[PDB]
Design an enzyme around this catalytic site. Structure first.
Site, PDB file in Angstrom:
ATOM      1  N   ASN A   1     -10.099  -1.950   4.035  1.00 31.40           N
ATOM      2  CA  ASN A   1     -10.018  -1.731   2.596  1.00 31.40           C
ATOM      3  C   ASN A   1     -11.384  -1.730   1.948  1.00 31.40           C
ATOM      4  O   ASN A   1     -12.399  -1.654   2.632  1.00 31.40           O
ATOM      5  CB  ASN A   1      -9.093  -2.736   1.888  1.00 31.40           C
ATOM      6  CG  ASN A   1      -9.072  -4.087   2.540  1.00 31.40           C
ATOM      7  OD1 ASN A   1     -10.056  -4.513   3.148  1.00 31.40           O
ATOM      8  ND2 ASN A   1      -7.948  -4.792   2.400  1.00 31.40           N
TER       9      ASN A   1
ATOM     10  N   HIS B   1       0.857  -1.200   0.000  1.00 33.29           N
ATOM     11  CA  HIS B   1       0.000   0.000   0.000  1.00 33.29           C
ATOM     12  C   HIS B   1       0.885   1.239   0.000  1.00 33.29           C
ATOM     13  O   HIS B   1       0.645   2.188   0.745  1.00 33.29           O
ATOM     14  CB  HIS B   1      -0.904   0.055   1.242  1.00 33.29           C
ATOM     15  CG  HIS B   1      -1.965  -1.006   1.290  1.00 33.29           C
ATOM     16  ND1 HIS B   1      -3.285  -0.749   0.993  1.00 33.29           N
ATOM     17  CD2 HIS B   1      -1.906  -2.313   1.639  1.00 33.29           C
ATOM     18  CE1 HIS B   1      -3.992  -1.853   1.161  1.00 33.29           C
ATOM     19  NE2 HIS B   1      -3.181  -2.816   1.554  1.00 33.29           N
TER      20      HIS B   1
END
Ligand code: HEM
Ligand code: HEM
Ligand code: HEM
Lengths: 479, 479, 479, 481
Positions: free
Chosen positions: A124, A51
């Site tokens: 997420n 990420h």
């Protein structure tokens, strides 16, 4: 404004360096040059191990409904209560220079600065994940990254791992559906994904799921567009987010939860704590809790976005972790990696500081200690000098578990049921066709023996799933 | 009493017992409280200073008493009666963090002035001269003074081999082994900038100078016997003495002077005016009173205000510049360099080091542990049309032309004894000369005999009686 | 001789004079020889250990003399006469890198066995017990043992306020203040695993154990007077003694034994068999001879073989596992953690730490300073279909089922006197008891009276004479 | 199949499941197999280079083909036929680790020759010149080429504000926007040391020079369109091309030349020979052939051999030295400094950085991650009466004397258009100029108008046609919007 050196000494000229004669060499006494150059030389820190590409904004969380019967956490304390939040959107595999509009899951981390400390809800855009045991996460991530020798993306790595670990079926399906590429960060939903534990003032507990739906609606980019955008504007996600807030179009999400009593956790068909499973809404409906509103752009990206750090383990009284193995592993990984990426005292960094809270303990020193280091307050506990004392009220909810302390294999927990229900019920024919084409278009680059096991797995979900994918693959390998 | 928390500000129910499975079962990862506290303890240490690791700190101010604006335009000197806050750190040299305070070794006497024109660090010690005159031999010099690469024990063979091979050390070695070698705490010793520096006034006129701050409490040393006893009874004698003093209102102070040598005088000085192994005889270059140094505030937290403080000789505000002294020239680089290592890229943000009376503004950005707004969104490139910080022509450095080619010039030819004999025969009286020879012999006796000879030959080059009395003493020991 | 180079292998023409513009000009940046050497000197230091910082190291081997294969399948014990190379580091506890060796304090006696089943790290010390039995109290205990956060001085109130509020410390405190408190060097003290561990045989059957390594050179201690004299005369006594012995061939050795306690016996045990404050009486659980520890080689470069060495209690090969001891449990995390900070992510690549007699293979990669071939191009994900390393079932860990809820269980009130009363009355004779009370009081008297009171209150709990005698002595000190 | 282990070499029974209290219980701290692997995963990232982040590596050798010993005593040149192993890393400039390979931007071309006299790093690009001529502007220039400090987006106003306030850039900018701005892979571009260095012979005689390595695979560039279609289809194009090429026997090569300018010639050069924005015309200074560069081996592990590779311009063995070129003088410091940050104090121990063909001996010790024996018990102070390593006078640097005082000398006003006009009119054909104006306008049109004015202003100084053709374009663009 007077241009200075790091130590505040005015600079006479910072456009030409000191030399012995107009065409002579550079002198060490030109400390202005060195001071600046040395800092330029240390500008970079390591990017997040995953990420890495991200966008960030700020706002608040506001309670709209009463759920105190479930959680005693102050963040939910009373209706209409507002708590400041910091949010970070992101992709997964790609590194700092990669495009935003590519297929990948999307990070959606939310930091709540509550008076009971910070509460980091690192979720997420998908309710589930690819695997259910933290010990496979490094391997998975490696397989999603670059080949160790060529440093190129490797379909063989991707699918050999997925085909060997079919539990990845559920999330691999969600990832290749239209939602694999959301149109920016404002047009997707957020999920804590894991099952967490809520505890009320009475000390009774329940398990929950966190959900925050986009108030702006779901919107995705077709593969054609995503590709075009990955080249025209690799930072599309950042731009979109920053321009919205900049123009007053503050995006928001409606925050709900799902509640499962301990009994229900038992009657639940599968392991309620298996990250590859969802709690069907029909059966466990969403409960309104509040809103998440992003109304402020960062001023300095590096200081407010790159350096921000979310730790799933940051949980205040009223919110605790469940036995979910994946989450259990995340309780250690984040602070661990943060002390590496950012530094032993990363929590002193403005955005990571728990500012609505009074931080008092017996911790001291460490590199880059910025505060007063808690002055001369006694540093050992217990002590007879009135230093900070522990408070019973914040004791963890205890449970009795049965079984031996060993490694239990979960490779064979249900790997296809829910996947079937999503394939034949949740999706329609178009989505179903596309799902197959997106998978086929990526799997076709893998070696055939890998292609074969992949398809066997999809066939276990539904013979049509596999066979249709196999058809496209044949077309591809025909060339 | 404060509520005990984790680093993220979450309340701690119980920080005296850890979470286990059953009373006699294994430890749990979800016991985030334990890990949080333990992971920090685990990172409490930073590397000590490569040299001058053992230290003491106190704070106060510098107040101008006399007008020296004719020589320097530095603001810290601007007008009489002007007070400028100062930070000081006293230290030994060879010993590491747990070594004793009362041992023969020079003494660091670093002073940081938080001026409106940025920080001005005067990193000096209790002696006007040093052991060598070229920065490039400093590491070897320090190595020789520290531990054997193998035994990890003090090595007299390393000490005297290096000194006897580097006769330019005669002067400092003589001062080092005189009573002044072991000052009775930091309050009873003097401070010098040692290096010749350059002062510039408002007309662009410059002179060379030496900084001295004489102890207003008076010179007072320890007998070697006492020193030995205290090193065992109180390894931190110095720290305690400095701290009790200030804590009891007996604020120690020093009178600040400067010696001036015009550029013409620089040419007629008998020796190299920039040779660090030489002093400027008062008799010819009188002390000019400038102001006072007063330490009246003990540190609140040692790690934050003392271990972490950093002094960089290169930190000199307009009005004060470096001279061509090779040693100082080398230090211009060493300090910020080692500081970026010991403390971190952004060590100047640590409070004690921050130039808080100045207005820092430049194009430096990012770096690990960035603490402020990182200068927000201000344009980060120079020049620029968006009105960022400008360089001011006032602070331009003094210009000078030099004779010769660019290459390494041997300075082993410089006098090594003239001033030393002066010190031996004039400055010291019988008593001292004797204790001097005794102090040296007690240490040199442990070196290999061939080294003892090379060293005696040097003490002889100064004065025949100097070398021979030492040999007389050595002969006894060698038996 | 060998040509002197820069780190890059470039020949140095003159490393005794720096490049300047003319004999009396400033220093040049193109003098890379200078910068190169200086930059390195500037980074010589790394953080010292958070505890046990002052140390001495050596090397040798372990040799199996008896057969314990019925208790453990661990290869290191495989067969009588089998020899394994070992690395060892002795040390004090509270003192930092420059402290005296001959001072009162426990002594670290860490042993690294380089086995074919990977490194086995037995991190023990000169005592079978410790001051506390819950790892969460460790940082506070260590804090209370080191310098005052403000004055930076050893503080008696911190030492005794902690020990008095936590009487479980009585046992190890009685041992620490006894003659064994200051062993005459490392060779004349015993070594203990302290913690209770678990052994597993080839059949899967398990037993609990204690590791012991008695000095073949016999127990020898230093009187406080001697200790003091030496801390003055030779702060590195312990280092010189060990080194000289090995240098002259007087290789020190230790007879390695184990105490065994079956799981049945574990239940019947009067105390908690995993309580670090308690011993297993030799009378009821006799030492079983196992092998021999022999140190026959000193380090060649201390910083590389001793300072940089790293032992991790969690380094245990098949046949050797951890017991539920809360202390041991926490250490499983703390060491590799602090090591990644003190040394760095790949500290296991440092030669003395590398398990060289083992064949390391896994899916770990990269990290700061990767020193090998980083496992070439091998598949970096598990599982994989490309013949990469596979887990071997026989290395699985022993399975036990525990009873009780998962929560924090107070142990502050476990037995704190019984075994102490035994040591005070049975083990020690009168000369010893006297000396013990004298040694304790001599330190306890610097503490404020209320602190003294509570202390004497606990000693009295052990025995009315123990507490009362100390009080008597204290009275004289306060008089 | 080898046995799977922890980092300490302990065999792993099961590395697919974690230890929990029961099948549905929490995770245990004693599962150190998990922590050991997880802890390492959490640390596999180091800082990327501050510039030239995105890269591709390969290894091979340098072979001497002609005798240039009259100019340099450097062993690497010692004699015809002599081969020296080398390491190379290609790269872009602005984009970070995940950026696309095919984008307009210079290209790094670093060469590490592991010589007997230590390593010699020739850190050059695919251009003979650069944007600025004083190192104190390099951080600024870099900041302007990267992301906005607040939005984190590329910023044209930043790009052009800098280039318009610093016109000296005209030369290299005219090159950056020419067809050569986007080379087709790393195998079809030239290599330049760019800076003016100094060569020294066995006599102590010195000369100034320029290093050049022309692509034997021939020049070849990507059109703007392909470059974009590619930045999307394969952002790692450059890496893949170089790797397959080598893996399939298409070992790429470059021919190594040098240009020599004597000290006498230097005092009469119409420009400052040490100006990084100028070139030495081949007509007046013919390229002298020296050797050949061959890349015949791919890396085995990218992280170990490529991401961790470090080149320091200051790494020069006897025979080769730096010139007073302000820019180069600055880099003499930047690299080792940044490397200490990026890799670590002892980054020179990392295998690909180690001068393995040389014999390292000195008085430097310790530091974090000290990998070797730390030079054992050898005496660590110099001088010493115990034999330890000694300086060899033959390695002493060449000495010159300079005139003038020690101060900052402005150079913002040295010639900024002359050499540029040559390139624009002489060097480029009509086709090229048009493409040049177009590629400039297309990027500059996003910058503010005042920034546009000043930029065009300068292009005009180089040549009225240059500026007018761009302005003509800017108008259409600014109109369109
Ligand atoms: C060319 C010779 C010298 C070099 C290269 C040099 C280098 C160093 C270095 C690298 C440090 C570490 C600073 C830190 O980590 O905070 C240090 C500290 C120190 N040096 Fe020097 N030094 C030199 C000469 C001297 C001299 C001449 C004096 C006195 C005038 C001196 C006094 C000190 C003091 C007081 C400290 C403590 C600095 C602090 O507390 O930050 N040094 N030196
Ligand atoms: C729960 C309490 C304990 C914790 C968490 C703990 C923590 C630590 C830490 C972080 C270090 C630093 C190691 C390094 O930097 O290399 C250390 C060193 C040391 N500890 Fe412990 N420790 C504890 C109890 C003890 C006990 C009971 C013993 C032995 C019976 C022990 C013996 C040592 C020794 C010998 C060292 C030196 C290790 C080396 O040289 O690498 N410790 N400990
Ligand atoms: C005064 C201007 C310059 C400064 C101060 C400077 C600074 C830097 C720095 C700090 C790095 C990072 C190295 C690393 O992290 O490993 C770098 C990399 C690089 N630079 Fe420069 N640079 C300058 C001019 C140039 C020029 C004009 C060229 C070529 C002649 C160039 C080519 C490269 C290349 C190819 C890399 C890759 C080095 C590697 O792989 O280790 N730079 N530069």
């Amino acid at each position: 404004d007077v241009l200075t050196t790091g130590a505040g000494n005015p600079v006479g000229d910072k456009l030409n360096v000191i030399t012995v004669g107009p065409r002579g060499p550079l002198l060490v006494q030109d400390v202005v040059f060195t001071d600046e150059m040395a800092h330029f030389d240390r500008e970079r820190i390591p990017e997040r191990v995953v990420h890495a590409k991200g966008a960030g904004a700020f706002g608040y969380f506001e309670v709209t409904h009463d759920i105190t019967k479930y959680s005693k956490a102050k963040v939910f304390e009373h209706i209409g209560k507002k708590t400041p939040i910091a949010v970070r959107f992101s992709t997964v595999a790609g590194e700092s220079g990669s495009a935003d509009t590519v297929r990948d899951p999307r990070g959606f981390a939310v930091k709540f600065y509550t008076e009971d400390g910070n509460w980091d809800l690192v979720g997420n855009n998908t309710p589930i994940f690819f695997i259910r045991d933290p010990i496979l996460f490094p391997s998975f991530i490696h397989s999603q990254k670059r080949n160790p020798q060529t440093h190129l993306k490797d379909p063989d790595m991707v699918w050999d791992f997925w085909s060997l670990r079919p539990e990845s079926l559920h999330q691999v399906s969600f990832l290749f559906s239209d939602r694999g590429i959301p149109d920016g960060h404002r047009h997707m939903n957020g999920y804590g994904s894991h099952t967490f534990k809520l505890v009320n003032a009475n000390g009774e507990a329940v398990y929950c799921k966190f959900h925050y739906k986009t108030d702006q609606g779901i919107k995705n980019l077709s593969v054609e567009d995503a590709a075009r955008l990955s080249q025209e504007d690799p930072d599309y996600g950042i731009r979109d987010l920053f321009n919205a807030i900049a123009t007053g179009k503050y995006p928001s999400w409606t925050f709900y939860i799902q509640v499962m009593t301990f009994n229900q956790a038992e009657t639940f068909p599968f392991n309620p704590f298996d990250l590859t499973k969802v709690w069907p809404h029909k059966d466990y409906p969403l409960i309104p809790v509040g809103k998440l509103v992003l109304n402020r752009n960062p001023v300095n990206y590096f200081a407010e976005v790159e350096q921000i750090a979310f730790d799933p383990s940051n949980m205040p009284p009223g919110i605790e972790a469940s036995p979910d193995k994946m989450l259990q592993g995340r309780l250690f990984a984040y602070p661990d990696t943060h002390r590496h990426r950012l530094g032993p005292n990363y929590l002193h960094i403005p955005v990571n500081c728990p500012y609505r809270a009074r931080v008092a303990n017996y911790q001291r020193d460490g590199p880059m200690c910025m505060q007063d280091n808690q002055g001369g307050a006694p540093n050992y506990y217990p002590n007879s000098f009135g230093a900070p004392e522990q408070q019973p009220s914040a004791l963890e909810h205890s449970i009795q578990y049965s079984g031996e302390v060993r490694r239990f294999n979960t490779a064979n927990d249900d790997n296809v049921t829910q996947v079937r229900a999503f394939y034949v019920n949740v999706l329609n024919e178009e989505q179903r066709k596309r799902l197959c084409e997106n998978i086929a278009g990526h799997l076709k680059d893998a070696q055939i023996f890998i292609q074969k096991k992949a398809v066997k797995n999809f066939t276990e979900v539904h013979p049509d799933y596999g066979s249709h994918i196999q058809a496209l693959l044949d077309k591809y390998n025909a060339e």
